[PDB]
Amino acid sequence: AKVTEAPKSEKTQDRHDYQGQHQTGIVTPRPAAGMMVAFDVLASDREDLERLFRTLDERIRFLMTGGAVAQVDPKLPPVDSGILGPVVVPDNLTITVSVGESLFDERFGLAEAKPKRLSRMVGFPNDALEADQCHGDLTLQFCANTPDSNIHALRDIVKNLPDLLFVRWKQEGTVPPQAPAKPGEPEQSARNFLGFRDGSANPDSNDARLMDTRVWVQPGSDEPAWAAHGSYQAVRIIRNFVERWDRTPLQEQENIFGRVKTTGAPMDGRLESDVPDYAKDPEGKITKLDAHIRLANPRTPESQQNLILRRPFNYSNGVNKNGQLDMGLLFICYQADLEKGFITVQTRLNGEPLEEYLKPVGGGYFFTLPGVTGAQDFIGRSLLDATKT
Ligand code: HEM
Ligand SMILES: [Cl-]
Ligand SMILES: [Cl-]
Ligand SMILES: [Cl-]
Ligand SMILES: [Cl-]
Ligand SMILES: [Cl-]
Ligand SMILES: [Cl-]
């Protein structure tokens, strides 16, 4: 009724189990709001590094559950920012912790336990990387139903870790919610800021064995033993030239991607779940040879080792000086091998016709730590236990 009255939400009690073999926020169903924040660790020794991960585990445990946060002593600063009121609600919140290559340098003595393919992001030919938006010691992926819940969670982290963490860069994004599909039917993949369904050909996140071979680091693999059940995280802040894209004919938009815009169907199919048959189209008349999906996934037995699980968000910043809207895709994908995953796929995508409307400006390579298995475990414990003494 009244203007400033808060909107009503029925999803404030949405929750996800923080514990598990894997961290949440990868195979977890993606909510409407996301945020990636990169940090630099200011720990002076191993004692401070241990306190950082223990404090991170304690705060994420509470933020992903909720509880009373009213400061009963007004002489002290409030324990909570108060954005969600005196009682914190979960609101589908998940926080995923990933570490970068710079965390495994001379500073912290973790160099021995570095994952094999964890490296520093090198600029691709179409890139225009901004130094203040790249790399970092650590990333925290915030995902919730609303951006305010993510901001409240980021407020909590920096309030409880003001000296051990330095905020490097951040990017918030959303995905457009849709009306519920027919009862018992799967929803469509959310659309990006280019108007296309994004995530249709993603590998089945419900297929556990497929996620074990392509997304999750398996025990017994060549990676260090502590890194089992982890995953490589690739972040790319890609700017969309939306004015020139909206001037492009629809047939050109679909030829560039290889998918019908409205239905999300391939050039030789009818449904979004359909996949193209490149064996029947060797010369690329139905699906162009330089199409986005054809270059990213040629659908050969060798290309199967390059599958990636994408989890992007649509981000929108301000406006530049010549009048163009600064908006694009917060690209996030996960893979058991970063070199085999995003790095090989992006190498195939170098020179694609989609680059006419793309401009990557930030991001980095990080390794998502394995999940917290029990109450006596905490995030990064297996990494700290692998580098003891
Ligand atoms: C920058 C690195 C990117 C990588 C590594 C990547 C990777 C992929 C992969 C693996 C697929 C699956 C294709 C298939 O299996 O047939 C795909 C499809 C697709 N991508 Fe990307 N992509 C990137 C950037 C983008 C950007 C910037 C957009 C902007 C709109 C985009 C939009 C799409 C669309 C619409 C599809 C088809 C729907 C789908 O199958 O998800 N991609 N991409
Ligand atoms: Cl699990
Ligand atoms: Cl601190
Ligand atoms: Cl932002
Ligand atoms: Cl549909
Ligand atoms: Cl500018
Ligand atoms: Cl312990």
200 labelled as ligand-binding?
yes
Cα 246 to ligand 2 centroid, rounded to whole Å:
42
CA dihedral defined by 117, 361, 24, 64, rounded to 10 degrees?
A: 140
Measured distance CA(264)–CA(275) in Å, rounded: 10
Rounded to 5 degrees, φ, ψ at 100 are -100, 175
Instruction: Find the residues whose C-beta lies inside 6 A of ligand 1.
Output: 192, 194, 196-201, 236, 238, 257, 259, 292-293, 296-297, 308, 329, 331, 342, 345-346, 358
> Which ligand 1 atom is the nearest neighbour of the CA of 264?
38
**Cβ-contact 143, 92 below 8 angstroms:** yes
Q: Which residue carries 């306190």 as its tokens?
A: 51
Closest residue by CA, ligand 1 atom 25: 331
**Cβ-contact 376, 322 below 8 angstroms:** no
292 labelled as ligand-binding?
yes
For the record, the structure tokens of 13 come out as: 């009690």
152 labelled as ligand-binding?
no
> Which ligand 1 atom is the nearest neighbour of the CA of 259?
37
Measured distance CA(121)–CA(137) in Å, rounded: 13
Sign of CA dihedral 163, 370, 314, 30: negative
For the record, the structure tokens of 100 come out as: 């970068």
Measured distance CA(136)–CA(124) in Å, rounded: 18
Rounded to 5 degrees, φ, ψ at 383 are -70, -40
* Resolution in Å, one decimal place: 2.3
The stretches of the chain forming alpha helices (DSSP H) are 46-63, 147-160, 208-214, 242-246, 250-257, 292-296, 344-349, 381-386
Three-class SS of residue 174? Answer: strand
CA neighbours within 13 Å on the CB side: how many for 112?
10
Determine the residue type at 378: F
Q: What is the DSSP letter of 7?
A: P
Closest residue by CA, ligand 1 atom 26: 329
> Which ligand 1 atom is the nearest neighbour of the CA of 346?
5
